[PDB]
Amino acid sequence: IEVWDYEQLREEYG
Amino acid sequence: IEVWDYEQLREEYG
Amino acid sequence: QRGGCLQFQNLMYRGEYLAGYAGETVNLRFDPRDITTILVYRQENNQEVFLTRAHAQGLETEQLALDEAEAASRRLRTAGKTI
Amino acid sequence: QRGGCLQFQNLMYRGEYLAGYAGETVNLRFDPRDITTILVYRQENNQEVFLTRAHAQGLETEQLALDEAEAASRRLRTAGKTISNQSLLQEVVDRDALKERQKLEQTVLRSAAVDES
Amino acid sequence: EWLQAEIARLKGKSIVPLQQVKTLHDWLDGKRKARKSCRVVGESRTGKTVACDAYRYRHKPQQEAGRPPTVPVVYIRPHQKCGPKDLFKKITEYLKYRVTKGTVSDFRDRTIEVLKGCGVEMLIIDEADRLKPETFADVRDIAEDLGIAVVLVGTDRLDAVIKRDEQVLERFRAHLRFGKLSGEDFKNTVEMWEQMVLKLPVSSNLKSKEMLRILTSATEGYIGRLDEILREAAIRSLSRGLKKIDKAVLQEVAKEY
Amino acid sequence: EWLQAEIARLKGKSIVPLQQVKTLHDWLDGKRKARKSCRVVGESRTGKTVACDAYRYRHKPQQEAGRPPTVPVVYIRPHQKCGPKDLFKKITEYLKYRVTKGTVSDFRDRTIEVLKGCGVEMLIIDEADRLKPETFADVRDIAEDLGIAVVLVGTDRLDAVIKRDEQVLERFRAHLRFGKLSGEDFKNTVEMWEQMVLKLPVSSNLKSKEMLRILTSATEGYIGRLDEILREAAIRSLSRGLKKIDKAVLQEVAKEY
DNA sequence: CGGCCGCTACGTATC
Ligand SMILES: Nc1ncnc2c1ncn2[C@@H]1O[C@H](COP(=O)(O)OP(=O)(O)OP(=O)(O)O)[C@@H](O)[C@H]1O
Ligand SMILES: Nc1ncnc2c1ncn2[C@@H]1O[C@H](COP(=O)(O)OP(=O)(O)OP(=O)(O)O)[C@@H](O)[C@H]1O
Ligand SMILES: [Mg+2]
Numbered sequence A, B: 001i002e003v004w005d006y007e008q009l010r011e012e013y014g
Numbered sequence C: 001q002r003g004g005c006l007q008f009q010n011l012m013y014r015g016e017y018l019a020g021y022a023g024e025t026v027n028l029r030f031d032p033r034d035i036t037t038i039l040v041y042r043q044e045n046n047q048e049v050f051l052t053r054a055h056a057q058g059l060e061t062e063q064l065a066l067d068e069a070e071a072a073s074r075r076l077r078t079a080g081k082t083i
Numbered sequence D: 001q002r003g004g005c006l007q008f009q010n011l012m013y014r015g016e017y018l019a020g021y022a023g024e025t026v027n028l029r030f031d032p033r034d035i036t037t038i039l040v041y042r043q044e045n046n047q048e049v050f051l052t053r054a055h056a057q058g059l060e061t062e063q064l065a066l067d068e069a070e071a072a073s074r075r076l077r078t079a080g081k082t083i084s085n086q087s088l089l090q091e092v093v094d095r096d097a098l099k100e101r102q103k104l105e106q107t108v109l110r111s112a113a114v115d116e117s
Numbered sequence E, F: 001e002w003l004q005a006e007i008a009r010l011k012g013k014s015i016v017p018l019q020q021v022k023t024l025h026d027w028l029d030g031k032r033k034a035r036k037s038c039r040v041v042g043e044s045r046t047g048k049t050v051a052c053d054a055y056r057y058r059h060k061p062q063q064e065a066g067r068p069p070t071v072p073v074v075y076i077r078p079h080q081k082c083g084p085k086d087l088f089k090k091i092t093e094y095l096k097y098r099v100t101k102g103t104v105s106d107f108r109d110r111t112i113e114v115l116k117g118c119g120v121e122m123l124i125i126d127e128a129d130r131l132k133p134e135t136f137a138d139v140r141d142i143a144e145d146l147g148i149a150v151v152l153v154g155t156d157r158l159d160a161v162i163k164r165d166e167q168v169l170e171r172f173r174a175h176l177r178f179g180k181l182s183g184e185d186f187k188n189t190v191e192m193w194e195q196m197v198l199k200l201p202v203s204s205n206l207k208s209k210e211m212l213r214i215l216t217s218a219t220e221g222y223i224g225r226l227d228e229i230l231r232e233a234a235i236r237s238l239s240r241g242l243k244k245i246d247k248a249v250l251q252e253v254a255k256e257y
Numbered sequence G: 001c002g003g004c005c006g007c008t009a010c011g012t013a014t015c
Helices: A006-012 B006-012 C066-079 D066-079 D085-097 D101-115 E002-010 E019-034 E048-056 E084-094 E104-117 E133-145 E156-162 E183-198 E209-219 E223-238 E247-254 F002-010 F019-034 F048-057 F084-094 F104-115 F133-145 F156-162 F166-171 F183-198 F209-219 F223-240 F247-254
Strands: C006-008 C011-015 C027-029 C037-044 C047-056 D005-008 D011-014 D026-031 D034-044 D047-056 E038-042 E073-076 E122-125 E149-153 E175-178 F038-042 F073-076 F122-125 F149-154 F175-178
Touching: A006 F048, B006 E048, C006 C037, D005 D026, D005 D034, D011 D085, D026 D047, D066 D085, D085 F183, E002 E223, E019 E048, E019 E122, E019 E149, E019 E175, E038 E048, E038 E156, E048 E073, E048 E122, E048 E149, E073 E084, E084 E104, E084 E133, E104 E133, E133 E149, E183 E209, E183 E223, E209 E223, E209 E247, E223 E247, E223 F019, F002 F223, F019 F048, F019 F122, F019 F149, F019 F175, F038 F048, F038 F156, F048 F073, F048 F122, F048 F149, F073 F084, F084 F104, F084 F133, F104 F133, F133 F149, F133 F166, F149 F156, F183 F209, F183 F223, F209 F223, F209 F247, F223 F247
Parallel strands: E038 E149, E038 E175, E073 E122, E122 E149, F038 F149, F038 F175, F073 F122, F122 F149
Antiparallel strands: C006 C011, C011 C047, C027 C037, C037 C047, D005 D011, D011 D047, D026 D034, D034 D047
């Protein structure tokens, strides 16, 4: 399943 | 017996 | 307190002269068998004198021992209700 | 019960042939020191015959004594939470981890029983 | 889309003629004709604000050609830690005047002028306990000086605040208490929501004993929970396609409380 | 260096799909459509924040033309002893507007303008118990005035604060609760940490009964300890040169508790 | 709407 890097979600967030 | 929509009461108000 | 209130065992009391003494400390003198009325004494010239009788607002016609007021208060605090 | 189940001191049990006998009555042999497992006997030809080793589902790795399941059930009843095998285990593991003379006595009594093994 | 129309409708709001509301209006007409100041109190979900909006939305402002409006009833709601200026600011705006920058006495003088100009008979203050203790001097003054019935609405904390000032307590002494539904009255009210509010395509029979146990334990008798539980159950059950509410789906909504 | 690449992976952070996160996102979608206020409660290591952040990273701001961003879900976190100006200030900044000098009524009037126009449906307040008691007046006000659902997130202490005020305790009575992992659910989750978060050179087989006993006593079912214990063990394993975790190295890490 | 079946709760007896 997909598991998200926590800093990547921050970089992608608006 | 009559029941009222809260928003209709607002629309009918002064 | 302001407006002549005293607080004692969670009951709030008011009385005939207390508002004129707001901010002072008074010696409450009370009977544990019935706390619905309290005698209020104050110190003047290092002499304790009688001031007034203070009555728990809204229950002046009831009676409460201090043990009833304390046990009921624990149930209210445990229940999570206001006092 | 249907689905091959036995429910007992709030704990629910599952057994290897037990679904064959839903609606029937069974004689259950158990250890008050360890109620995770139940021996199930049934009546046949007016004699007991052994049936199966039923186990508390999801507790096969775990050990509950009857006074722990009982104390957890009392606490769980009064806490207002739902009945389940873990829910009972959850109401054990806090009271375990966090003492009361009976639990302190039980710990010293246990240390003697350990030295018996 | 017939579903989406019901989801857009049911998340809305209504006012129902209930006994507690009819009782308040008969009482407030008494206080308005007699010009007597008083208070309305009771637990937070009894629906006191809806009962007061049903009063404000009756007794409509009257318009005369080029005059300021004649406004029989004013309902305002203060912000937290409301000061004397904030009360006067809101009364002035409600009567449709823009408030220009000034000292507290400019706001006081202009407020007294517009209350006397618009012919106000009653002033209703919701959540009265947001008022700072000194502002009650200005509320007592409005009621002493102008022929205005001030009505304070609040809950049991308002009494704990009123009882810290003898001047307010001995003026706002008359009062009506909003209470909880029970017995036949809770039973009869559940039928009024089923037939007048929910509009589901088949009867859900919510007044039946197997359903009243569910609803009684959920609502405790509060009209503000009854409307909330029954809208949430209607929204949810229509999004699954049923024409009713039933035992298990209502126990799903009630298990959230 | 191949070792350095992987050590930089383990000290990081990630969001794993789990049943609790998935439950919350279904429930909050029900609340966001219904515009119902609610609260989320549970113990401090259950992952309420990561579950809310995953919901903030769904429902991204829709930018258009030269209009303000359309933000369906606003998530803020207050500072300790948060006042009425501190709440508006953060709401205004999160929506990307600059706050300038003024008084309380100005932050309030301005907050309501940016909440309008710009499409807010839900406001999520983390650590809700940092709010000063009076600010709840402004939180209720918004929830009732604007069709905005407000969600309060917090620990059991939050409810101890909330029960001090009926007015709040009734708008926010509906709740969802986060629990602890057990039985099959703890065992199954340990495999996801191994196969999706750790991804060690060869498999440590943490679902094996002896590794589960060590992990159970260590973690007590908290996802915020499972995430911590296994990173600490995997960093120690790799920096000592091991291709997996083993009984003794995991007991060295768990003995720090 | 009505009946049958597991888990709790009250009453009684004894060391
Ligand atoms: N007479 C009524 N008819 C229809 N719906 C009602 C009625 N009274 C209350 N409700 C419903 O229940 C809710 C009760 O909230 P309401 O604002 O009326 O309570 P309140 O007593 O003013 O609360 P609080 O004292 O906490 O401000 C309303 O928002 C509405 O949805
Ligand atoms: N789905 C998940 N995937 C990965 N890590 C997770 C997940 N859920 C929680 N965690 C981890 O669990 C730990 C708990 O932190 P988190 O902020 O989620 O807890 P919390 O219960 O919200 O805490 P608090 O109540 O103090 O705010 C963190 O290390 C976090 O990264
Ligand atoms: Mg109200």
